[PDB]
A paper describes a structure:
Here, we describe a high-throughput approach to serial oscillation crystallography. Using the silicon microchip technology with fast translation that has proven to be useful for serial collection of still data from crystals at XFELs and synchrotrons, we have found that adding oscillation to crystal data collection dramatically decreases the number of crystals needed to generate a complete dataset, compared with still data collection. The high-throughput, fixed-target serial oscillation crystallography method described here is a practical, fast and economical means to collect high-quality room-temperature diffraction data with minimized background scattering.
For example, in a previous work using the chip setup with CO-SWMb crystals, still data from 1776 crystals were required in order to generate a complete dataset; in our work, with 5° oscillations per crystal, only 138 crystals were needed. This is likely to be a combination of both oscillation and the relatively large bandwidth of the X-rays. In the case of lysozyme and CO-SWMb, which have smaller unit cells, 1° oscillation gave an insufficient number of reflections (<200) per dataset to calculate accurate scaling factors; many datasets did not have reflections in common with the others and XSCALE failed. Nonetheless, collecting lysozyme with 3° oscillation and CO-SWMb at 5° oscillation gave hundreds to thousands of reflections per dataset, which was sufficient to generate accurate scaling factors. On average, 1° of exposure at 10° s−1 led to ∼70 kGy of dose per crystal. This is tolerable for room temperature, but longer exposures, particularly on crystals with radiation-sensitive metals like the iron-containing CO-SWMb, may lead to significant radiation damage. To study this, we collected crystals of CO-SWMb at 5° oscillation – far more than needed per crystal – to effectively ‘burn’ each crystal with a dose of 197 kGy.
Author numbering: 0 to 153
Write the structure that this text describes.
């Protein structure tokens, strides 16, 4: 919501580890999101037709879209909260086109945290998790504000 410089540094230190295998992370993140919250899968006309985890893992379009997620998220995180300009095209498309409730951003946030733990068991401790949770919460809160700015949501 306002992160210390130390929390931002933790977030960016973890993000460098995402950026080492963006495709792997983005794929895992989307797969965890879809398994943990199947209702979010129905939002994706391109993916609605993927059922087992093994099918999702073989979908190169799913992998590609994971990259799209994480590169966009990464650009935002690197702004360390000064992300107003980067949020609006995202808020605009997710509020008005894809028509995504903020609650779904909470689900993918949990999916990010979970995947970071499974891919970096030793690098992603309690500190880094707190910082990343805070950064993603700030992201969600700011996206929520941008929804309301566009006249949408709760
Ligand atoms: C960290 C959170 C997220 C980020 C950074 C993100 C980013 C993006 C980006 C960059 C695109 C492509 C351009 C666009 O349509 O805006 C996209 C498309 C899309 N997003 Fe997200 N997204 C996030 C969370 C979610 C969630 C949780 C859902 C649904 C449960 C969702 C649903 C969609 C859909 C349906 C599309 C269109 C994809 C397609 O064309 O097949 N997004 N997202």
């Amino acid at each position: 919501m306002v992160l210390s410089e130390g929390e931002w540094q933790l977030v960016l230190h973890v993000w460098a580890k995402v950026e080492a295998d963006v495709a792997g992370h983005g794929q895992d993140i989307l797969i965890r999101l879809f398994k943990s919250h199947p209702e979010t899968l129905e939002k994706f006309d391109r993916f609605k037709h993927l059922k087992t985890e093994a099918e999702m893992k073989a979908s190169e379009d799913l992998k590609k879209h994971g990259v799209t997620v994480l590169t966009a998220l990464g650009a935002i995180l690197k702004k360390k909260g000064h992300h107003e300009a980067e949020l609006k095209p995202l808020a605009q498309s997710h509020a008005t086109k894809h028509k995504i409730p903020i609650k779904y951003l909470e689900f993918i946030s949990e999916a990010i945290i979970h995947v970071l733990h499974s891919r970096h068991p030793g690098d992603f401790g309690a500190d880094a998790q707190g910082a990343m949770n805070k950064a993603l919460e700030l992201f969600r809160k700011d996206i929520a504000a941008k929804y309301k700015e566009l006249g949408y949501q709760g």
